[PDB]
Design a protein around this nucleic acid. Structure first.
Ligand SMILES: Nc1nc2c(ncn2[C@@H]2O[C@H](COP(=O)(O)OP(=O)(O)OP(=O)(O)O)[C@@H](O)[C@H]2O)c(=O)[nH]1
Ligand SMILES: [Mg+2]
Ligand SMILES: [Mg+2]
Ligand SMILES: [Mg+2]
Ligand SMILES: [Mg+2]
Ligand SMILES: [Mg+2]
Ligand SMILES: [Mg+2]
Ligand SMILES: [Mg+2]
Ligand SMILES: [Mg+2]
Ligand SMILES: [Mg+2]
Ligand SMILES: [Mg+2]
Ligand SMILES: [Mg+2]
Ligand SMILES: [Mg+2]
Ligand SMILES: [Mg+2]
Ligand SMILES: [Mg+2]
Ligand SMILES: [Mg+2]
Ligand SMILES: [Mg+2]
Ligand SMILES: [Mg+2]
Ligand SMILES: [Mg+2]
Ligand SMILES: [Mg+2]
Ligand SMILES: [Mg+2]
Ligand SMILES: [Mg+2]
Ligand SMILES: [Mg+2]
Ligand SMILES: [Mg+2]
Ligand SMILES: [Mg+2]
Ligand SMILES: [Mg+2]
Ligand SMILES: [Mg+2]
Ligand SMILES: [Mg+2]
Ligand SMILES: [Mg+2]
Ligand SMILES: [Mg+2]
Lengths: 101, 97, 94, 166, 275, 140, 148
RNA sequence: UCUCUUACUUUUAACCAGUGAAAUUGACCUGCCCGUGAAGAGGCGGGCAUAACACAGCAAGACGAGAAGACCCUAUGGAGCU
RNA sequence: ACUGAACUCCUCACACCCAAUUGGACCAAUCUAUCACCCUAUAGAAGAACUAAUGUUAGUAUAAGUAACAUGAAAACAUUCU
RNA sequence: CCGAGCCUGGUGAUAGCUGGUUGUCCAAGAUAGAAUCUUAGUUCAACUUUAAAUUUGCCCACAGAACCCUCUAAAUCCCCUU
RNA sequence: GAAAUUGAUGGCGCAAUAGAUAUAGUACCGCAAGGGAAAGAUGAAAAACCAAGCAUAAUAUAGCAAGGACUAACCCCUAUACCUUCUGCAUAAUGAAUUAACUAGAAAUAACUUUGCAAGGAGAGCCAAAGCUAAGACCCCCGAAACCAGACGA
C-alpha cells in the first residue's frame, strides 16, 4: 500500500516483518515528499539521495480475531473459521531531504 | 440452569484397595499353570454369557436357550418379544443388504 | 403497466434486450484480439514431418517419472523411537 | 422463592465521619402473595413512584383500585417502621424512591368451555415492593429547553470528524 | 443432578468472575499481590529504561517520607527521596528550559516557563510514571499513590539517574519521556492564556510592528445559527494570520492565537522535534 | 441417563455472548440468537469486499470533488497523473486533497499540464518534440 | 463482529518509539507443575528456554512458580497495567516459545478492532481543507448580488 | 318481507371496580404504487410516503385461525357390500 | 477516458466456499484403568452432543388484563318494599 | 367418535408414504440405460468415493469407415505426433 | 432346519422428565374389562450470583432488524429468516410462541489397517496352494387405517 506519512506517525502493517521490536528501518519506496511550500514527485519513485524516511518497529501483535462464516440456506452448509492476522506497528521517526535536485 | 451451583462432594478413589491392587491376577492362569484352567473360567457373571460374546440377538437367544425355563413369566414373554423384534430388525432392516 | 408475460429472457415474449455502444466496443476489441491470434497462428515454425518425434524422449521420460511415482506407493517406515517417544507423556520432575 | 428485599433492611453502614454528608435513610418494605395481578399493581406502583409519602397516601386513599388499599397499608407500615427502627426523624420527610410489583406464586385452575374443552386459569398473586428514602422528593426532571436542545445539536455538529481518512 | 465435576467447576469459575465484576475488589498495590520481588523489579526497571541506575540511589528515590512515617508508626505498634527529588526537579526544569529555548528561540520566557510547567505538571508526570511503572515500585503509605507523591518519586528517579549516569544521559531521558509528551499538543493547549489579542499587540509593539487591524476576510451564513467567519489580522495592509470562528469576536480571538503561534514559531507545521 | 451433557450452559453462552447486543428475543433465546448470530457472522464475512469497494468509491468521490474544485474531472486527473508516471493511489490522493490542498493543487496543475500536452500532440500529430512532462522515464 | 466488539485507535503507550523503544512487557509469571502431562511442555521450556529468554529480555522479570496445576499458565503484565493470561496447557516447547516471544513483542493495549491502520497527530502540514480553500476572494469582500 | 327505513325499551355494548380463558403466535423495527419472482409481495428493484404511541369501529389483505382436503390421483395401503 | 468481481497482480498466509453420498483429521461432556490434584493427561468404553419430528413433560409468555362471569331497593341490618 | 363396539394382548404390527434424524474442520463428489404388478420403489449398468497394482489415458497427422439416392449438413469414429 | 457324534461373587447400572407405573396400582378417568399420574430436597441440633417471563427502565421516520461502520444508539451504504421438500422457495409450500429437560445408526459376509505365529494358525471342532488367529471399523426414530385371540359391556 501507499501511506501518507509524517514524523511521529504510526503505521499498522498487516503482517510480521521479521524484525525485532525497537529496530530501526529505512522505507525506500517513497513516491512523494512534501513541505508547506514545495513538493517533490517521483517518476514513480524519488531518489535515495533525495529522500530518507526512517521508522522503528514499535510493536508486533496479532490482529483481533476475524470471523469467516460461510452459510448457504437449505443445504446444511454452515462453516466457521477464526483468523488472527499478524501485524506490526511502526513509528516514523524522521523524514529527511537532501539538496540533490 | 441445568448446571449445579455448587461443587459436587469430592470423589476420593482408593487406587490401592484390594480389588484394584489384585486386579488382573490369574489372568494368565492357563499359560502359567499348565493350562489346567482357561482364563474364561475366571469370569463371574450370568451363566449364559460366561466366556462368550455376541450381539443383542445372539445374547437373547442364548439367554432363552440356557435359562429360559427358569425365567419369570413376564420376563420370558419380554425376552420372546425382544427376540422376535431383533430377528425382524436384523433380517429385514438396515442400510446394507 | 408494461408487463412482460411469464419470465423475462426465456419465454416466447421476452423482455427486449438492446446492445449498447459499450458492448459493441467490447465485442470489437475481442474480435481484434482474435484476428491477431489468427495471424500469429498462421505462421508455424516447423512442419509436421519436422516436428515428428522431436519431443518423444522428453515425453517418455516424463511418463517414466509418473510411472515410478505411481509404483513407489508403499506404506511408510515405522520407528522404535516413534513408538517409545509416547512414554514421555508421563515425564515429570524430581 | 427469593426474599432479598426483606434482608435489604439489615445492612449496617460504618459510622460516618463528621466531615461527611448525612446519609439519607433507606427503608425497604414489601408485601408478599397479594391476591392481585402484578400488571394491575404496576399502575399503582408507577403512580406513587417518586412522590412523597403523604402525596402517595393521598392519591391511594382516593384511587378506586383494590391494590390502592394494599399499597396504602404497606406504605403506612413502612412509615411506622422507618420512624421506630430506622431513626427517621419526621414521618412526612420520606419519598418513594422505588415501587414495583413482582409476580407471586400462582395457582392453576380449570375453566370449563362449551364443548368439553377447557382453559387453564391462573389464580394470580403478586408481590409489592417499596423503598422509602428520607428527605424531600427529588425535583422532577425539567423538560429540556430549546436552548439546551440547540446546544446538544451544536455539540453533535462539533463532534464531527473527517471519517475514513488520515 | 447430573454426574460430573468439570462443568460444575467451570460454572463456579464463571460465577466467581461475575461476582468480581458485580463487586470489584478495591485496588491493591502490586507489591501485595503474588509474584513480586523488589530487587528484581527495580533491576528490570533500570534495564528496561536502558540506563545504569545505581541501585541504592534508585531505592532511595522510590522510598518516600510518608512511607517512612507509616513504617515507624507500624513499628511502634531509611533515607527518603526528598533531596533526590529536589535535584531531579531542578535539573528537569533547567534542561527542559534549555531544550525549549533552543527549539523556539522566539518563544517568550513566560511561554517557555508555562511549557516547562505543563511538562513537569502533575498530570503529565503522573501519566508518564504510571505508564513507566514508577507507581508499582513506589513506596507510599496509601494506594493508589497520590499524584503529588508520584510526581515527587518520578523526579527522585530523575535525580538518581543524574547522580548515576550524568547530565547528558539524564537530558536524553528527559527528551525521551517528557519532551515527547508535547507531541500533538497545541501551544495554548499547553500554555493557557487570556487576551491573546493583548498578547499579540504587546509582542508586535516589542517587535516594532504597527498594531494589527482586524478584518473580515471571509464569511458564510452571517444571519444563520451556524455562521463561519474567517477574520484576518493585517499589519501595514499585510496579513500576518487569519482564524476561523462561529462569531466575529471568536474568529478574531482565534486569529490572534494563530498570529501568536506564528510569531513564537510553534506553528502546527513547524519542524518536528529531532531525536 | 448414562451420559448427559453438562456444558450446555457454556455452549449456549458461546452464542448468546455474540447475540447480547441484538433486539428483542434474538439476544435471549438460543433458538433465535443462533440464527441471528449466524446471519451476523455471514454478513461480517461478506462485508470486507463491500468495505474495500466503498472505500474506493469514497476515495473516488472525494478526488472528484477536489478535481472539480480545481476545474478538472476525475478521469482526466487520474489518467493524466498516470501518464505523468505518478503512481499515487486513490486513497493517498483523497488524503492529499483533504489534508494537503496545496499539494493537491500542484497535482491537479500537473495533470492539466499533461492533458494539454497530449492535446497539443494530437493536434500537431507528427514528429513534433515531445511535451516536457510527457516524456516518460524508462526503466530496464 | 466489529459492531458487537469494542474498538480503539492505533496508538502507543507513551510514544514508545520517538525517544527510545521501551519493551512494554514487564512481568511474566509461569505457573507450572512438577507432575502432569499438561505442563510437560512448560517444564521443558523452563529447563531449556526460560533462561535464554530472561537474559535476552533483561527488562522483564520472570517468576516461575512450580505448584500443582492442571492448566499451566503464563501471565504477562505490561507497563500500561494490562494483564494478559494465556494457557500453555498441552503446548510444545516451540509453541510456548512462540507465545512468550509474541507476548514480549506485543504492547499492553487491548487486542480489539483498530479503527484506522494509521495514527497521525499532525495530519496536515499545508492546512486542513475547508470550504474557503480553493475559493478566490473578491474586491472589498463583496458577497454575490451585493450592491455596494 | 319490501318500496324505505325510522323511533323506543331490554340485552349486548363503552367507561369504573373485582375475577379472569381460548384457538393463534419463526422472529418482526409489521406502509402505498408499479415491475419482478415459486408465475397474486409489508420484507425483492424503481418510485412515493413516513415523529411517537393509545382508545372505538371495519372486515379489503396478512393466499387469515380451525381441522396432515372428505373433491381428484397414487399406494403391488385398507375396509364395507355384491 | 473513466467506473466496475471473490478474475488477475500486489504485501503476508494458505487444507479453510457444490445437494445425496464417500475418505480423513480433531473433539465437548460422562464412566473405568492409571495419572493429575483450582480441571488435567495417555488409553478403554458408551443411554457419548438437538435452532426444528402439528415431537413428550414442565415453566412462562402472546392473544389479554381482552372474551366472559356476578349482587333487586332502603334501613335499626329489627325490618319493610318491588 | 359403529360399513361394525370397547379394553387388553400378538404389538415396537406393517407402511416403496410424510415428517425428523443432535459436535468442529478439510477433501472428492450432479453421467448414458435395462428389467421390474414397474415407472412415489428396487437390482444390474453408468456416474461417484476410497485403497492398491500396473501402463498407458486425453488432445489427435496422413491413410481409412456404402450403396440404396440425382444432390444431400454441422460433425463423428479411427488416429501417430504434440 | 436336525441327528448320529462331541463334551459341559457384585456393577466402566440409573440418581426424581432417569431408574420399577409406583411416594401408588393410590389420586383421577371409565358402567365394566381397563387406563393411570404428579411429586421431595435447611441444618449437628428447629427443645436454634444462573433459563424463559417480567420489573428496575414504553416509545421517534426506514423496513429478516444485522453487518461495514462512525465521534455519535439511530440516521448513511449492503443484505429476499431457518428447516424440510423441490427442477426451482423470501416465498402467500411444511414445522416452529419461547425456556429447561428428554428425544432418534443396532450387525453379519467379504474386504482394509494393525499385532502375533507362520506352511501352518487357532486354548479340540475350523481354515489353509501365505495362510490363520486377535482387534479396530458400516447399517436410525415417530406415525396409520388395518388383521386376529381373549375379556368387558343392553
Ligand atoms: N453378584 C452378587 N453377589 C451378591 C449378591 N448379594 C450378595 N452377594 C454376595 O454374597 C456374598 C456374601 O454376602 P454377605 O451379605 O456378606 O453375607 P451372607 O448374608 O452370608 O450372604 P448370602 O448367603 O449370599 O445371603 C458377598 O460376596 C456378596 O457380594 C447379589 O445380588 N449379587
Ligand atoms: Mg413474470
Ligand atoms: Mg359436558
Ligand atoms: Mg394464561
Ligand atoms: Mg375490567
Ligand atoms: Mg406484485
Ligand atoms: Mg385498533
Ligand atoms: Mg382467503
Ligand atoms: Mg387458512
Ligand atoms: Mg393430506
Ligand atoms: Mg393390498
Ligand atoms: Mg476494483
Ligand atoms: Mg478422554
Ligand atoms: Mg443420545
Ligand atoms: Mg434444548
Ligand atoms: Mg420441538
Ligand atoms: Mg396479561
Ligand atoms: Mg382485542
Ligand atoms: Mg364484555
Ligand atoms: Mg361408542
Ligand atoms: Mg415403523
Ligand atoms: Mg470440494
Ligand atoms: Mg445332539
Ligand atoms: Mg419416575
Ligand atoms: Mg432471565
Ligand atoms: Mg408474509
Ligand atoms: Mg412459510
Ligand atoms: Mg406438502
Ligand atoms: Mg402454523
Ligand atoms: Mg334396559
Amino acid at each position: 500500500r501507499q501511506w501518507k506519512v509524517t514524523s511521529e506517525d504510526l503505521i499498522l502493517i498487516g503482517n510480521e516483518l521479521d524484525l525485532a521490536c525497537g529496530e530501526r528501518i529505512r522505507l525506500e519506496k517513497v513516491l512523494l515528499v512534501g513541505a508547506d511550500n514545495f513538493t517533490l514527485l517521483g517518476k514513480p519513485l524519488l531518489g535515495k539521495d533525495l529522500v530518507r524516511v526512517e521508522a522503528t518497529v514499535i510493536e508486533k501483535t496479532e490482529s483481533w480475531p476475524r470471523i469467516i462464516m460461510r452459510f448457504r440456506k437449505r443445504k446444511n452448509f454452515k462453516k466457521k473459521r477464526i483468523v488472527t492476522t499478524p501485524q506490526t506497528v511502526l513509528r516514523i521517526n524522521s523524514i529527511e531531504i537532501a539538496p540533490c535536485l | 440452569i441445568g448446571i449445579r451451583l455448587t461443587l459436587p462432594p469430592p470423589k476420593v478413589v482408593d487406587r490401592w484397595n484390594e480389588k484394584r491392587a489384585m486386579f488382573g491376577v490369574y489372568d494368565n492362569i492357563g499359560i502359567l499353570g499348565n493350562f489346567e484352567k482357561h482364563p474364561k473360567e475366571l469370569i463371574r457373571g450370568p451363566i449364559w454369557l460366561r466366556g462368550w460374546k455376541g450381539n443383542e440377538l445372539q445374547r437373547c437367544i442364548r439367554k432363552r436357550k440356557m435359562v429360559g425355563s427358569r425365567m419369570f413369566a413376564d420376563d420370558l414373554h419380554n425376552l420372546n418379544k425382544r427376540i422376535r423384534y431383533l430377528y425382524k430388525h436384523f433380517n429385514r432392516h438396515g442400510k446394507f443388504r | 403497466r408494461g408487463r412482460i408475460p411469464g419470465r423475462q429472457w426465456i419465454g416466447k415474449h421476452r423482455r427486449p434486450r438492446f446492445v449498447s455502444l459499450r458492448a459493441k466496443q467490447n465485442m470489437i476489441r475481442r474480435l481484434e484480439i482474435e484476428a491477431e491470434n489468427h495471424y500469429w497462428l498462421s505462421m508455424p515454425y516447423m512442419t509436421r514431418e519436422q516436428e515428428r518425434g522431436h519431443a518423444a524422449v522428453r515425453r517418455r521420460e516424463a511418463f517414466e517419472a509418473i510411472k515410478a511415482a505411481a509404483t513407489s506407493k508403499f506404506p511408510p517406515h515405522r520407528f522404535i523411537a516413534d513408538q517409545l517417544d509416547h512414554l514421555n507423556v508421563t515425564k515429570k520432575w524430581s | 422463592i427469593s426474599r432479598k428485599w426483606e434482608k435489604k433492611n439489615k445492612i449496617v453502614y460504618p459510622p460516618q465521619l463528621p466531615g461527611e454528608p448525612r446519609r439519607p435513610a433507606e427503608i425497604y418494605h414489601c408485601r408478599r402473595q397479594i391476591k392481585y395481578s402484578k400488571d394491575k399493581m404496576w399502575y399503582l406502583a408507577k403512580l406513587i413512584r417518586g412522590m412523597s409519602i403523604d402525596q402517595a397516601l393521598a392519591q391511594l386513599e382516593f384511587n378506586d383500585k383494590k391494590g390502592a388499599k394494599i399499597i396504602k397499608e404497606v406504605l403506612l407500615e413502612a412509615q411506622d417502621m422507618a420512624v421506630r427502627d430506622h431513626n427517621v426523624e419526621f414521618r412526612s420527610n420520606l419519598y418513594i424512591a422505588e415501587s414495583t410489583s413482582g409476580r407471586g406464586q400462582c395457582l392453576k385452575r380449570i375453566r370449563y368451555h362449551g364443548r368439553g374443552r377447557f382453559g387453564i386459569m391462573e389464580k394470580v398473586y403478586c408481590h409489592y415492593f417499596v423503598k422509602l428514602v428520607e428527605g424531600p422528593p427529588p425535583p422532577p426532571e425539567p423538560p429540556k429547553t430549546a436552548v439546551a436542545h440547540a446546544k446538544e445539536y451544536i455539540q453533535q455538529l462539533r463532534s464531527r470528524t473527517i471519517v475514513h481518512t488520515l | 443432578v447430573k454426574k460430573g465435576f468439570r462443568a460444575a467447576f467451570r460454572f463456579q469459575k464463571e460465577l466467581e468472575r461475575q461476582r468480581l465484576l458485580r463487586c470489584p475488589p478495591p485496588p491493591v498495590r502490586r507489591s501485595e499481590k503474588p509474584n513480586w520481588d523488589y530487587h528484581a523489579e527495580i533491576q528490570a526497571f533500570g534495564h528496561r529504561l536502558q540506563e545504569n541506575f545505581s541501585l541504592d540511589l534508585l531505592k532511595t528515590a522510590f522510598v518516600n517520607s510518608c512511607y517512612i512515617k507509616s513504617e515507624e508508626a507500624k513499628r511502634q505498634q531509611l533515607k527518603s527521596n526528598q533531596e533526590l527529588s529536589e535535584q531531579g526537579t531542578s535539573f528537569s526544569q533547567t534542561c527542559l528550559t534549555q531544550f525549549l529555548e533552543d527549539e523556539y528561540p522566539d518563544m517568550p520566557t513566560e511561554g517557555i516557563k508555562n511549557l516547562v510547567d505543563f511538562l513537569t505538571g502533575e498530570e503529565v508526570v503522573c501519566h508518564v510514571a504510571r505508564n513507566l511503572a514508577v507507581e508499582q515500585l513506589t513506596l507510599s503509605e496509601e494506594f493508589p499513590v497520590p499524584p503529588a507523591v508520584l510526581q515527587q518519586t518520578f523526579f527522585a528517579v530523575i535525580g538518581a539517574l543524574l547522580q548515576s549516569s550524568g547530565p547528558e544521559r539524564t537530558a536524553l531521558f528527559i527528551r525521551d519521556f517528557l519532551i515527547t509528551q508535547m507531541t500533538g499538543k497545541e501551544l495554548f493547549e499547553m500554555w493557557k492564556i487570556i487576551n491573546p489579542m493583548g498578547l499579540l499587540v504587546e509582542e508586535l509593539k516589542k517587535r516594532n510592528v504597527s498594531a494589527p487591524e482586524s478584518r473580515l476576510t471571509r464569511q458564510s451564513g452571517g444571519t444563520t445559527a451556524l455562521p463561519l467567519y474567517f477574520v484576518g489580522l493585517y499589519c501595514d495592509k499585510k496579513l500576518i494570520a487569519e482564524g476561523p470562528g462561529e462569531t466575529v469576536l471568536v474568529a478574531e480571538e482565534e486569529a490572534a492565537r494563530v498570529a501568536l503561534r506564528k510569531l513564537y514559531g510553534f506553528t502546527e507545521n513547524r519542524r518536528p522535534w529531532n531525536y | 441417563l448414562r451420559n448427559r451433557v453438562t456444558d450446555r450452559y457454556f455452549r449456549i453462552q458461546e452464542v448468546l455472548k455474540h447475540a447480547r447486543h441484538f433486539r428483542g428475543r434474538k439476544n435471549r433465546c438460543y433458538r433465535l440468537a443462533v440464527r441471528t448470530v449466524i446471519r451476523a457472522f455471514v454478513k461480517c464475512t461478506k462485508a470486507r469486499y463491500l468495505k474495500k469497494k466503498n472505500m474506493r468509491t469514497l476515495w473516488i468521490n472525494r478526488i472528484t470533488a477536489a478535481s472539480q474544485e480545481h476545474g478538472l474531472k476525475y478521469p482526466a486527473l487520474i489518467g493524466n497523473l498516470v501518464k505523468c508516471q505518478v503512481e499515487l493511489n486513490r486513497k493517498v490522493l483523497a488524503d492529499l486533497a483533504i489534508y494537503e490542498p496545496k499539494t493537491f493543487k500542484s497535482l491537479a496543475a500537473l495533470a492539466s499540464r499533461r492533458r494539454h500536452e497530449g492535446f497539443a500532440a494530437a493536434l500537431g500529430d507528427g514528429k513534433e518534440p515531445e511535451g516536457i512532462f510527457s516524456r516518460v522515464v524508462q526503466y530496464h | 463482529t466489529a459492531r458487537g466488539t469494542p474498538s480503539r485507535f492505533l496508538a502507543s503507550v507513551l510514544h514508545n518509539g520517538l525517544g527510545r523503544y521501551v519493551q512494554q512487557l514487564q512481568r511474566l509469571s509461569f505457573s507450572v507443575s512438577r507432575d502432569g502431562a499438561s505442563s510437560r511442555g512448560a517444564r521443558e521450556f523452563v529447563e531449556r528456554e526460560v533462561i535464554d529468554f530472561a537474559r535476552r529480555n533483561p527488562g522483564v522479570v520472570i517468576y516461575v512458580n512450580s505448584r500443582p496445576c492442571c492448566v499451566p499458565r503464563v501471565v504477562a503484565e505490561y507497563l500500561n497495567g494490562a494483564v494478559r493470561e494465556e494457557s500453555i496447557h498441552c503446548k510444545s516447547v516451540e509453541e510456548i516459545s512462540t507465545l512468550v516471544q509474541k507476548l514480549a513483542d506485543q504492547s499492553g493495549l487491548d487486542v480489539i478492532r483498530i479503527r484506522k491502520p494509521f495514527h497521525t497527530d499532525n495530519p496536515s502540514i499545508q492546512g486542513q481543507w475547508h470550504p474557503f480553500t480553493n475559493k478566490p476572494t473578491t474586491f472589498r469582500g463583496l458577497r454575490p448580488r451585493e450592491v455596494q
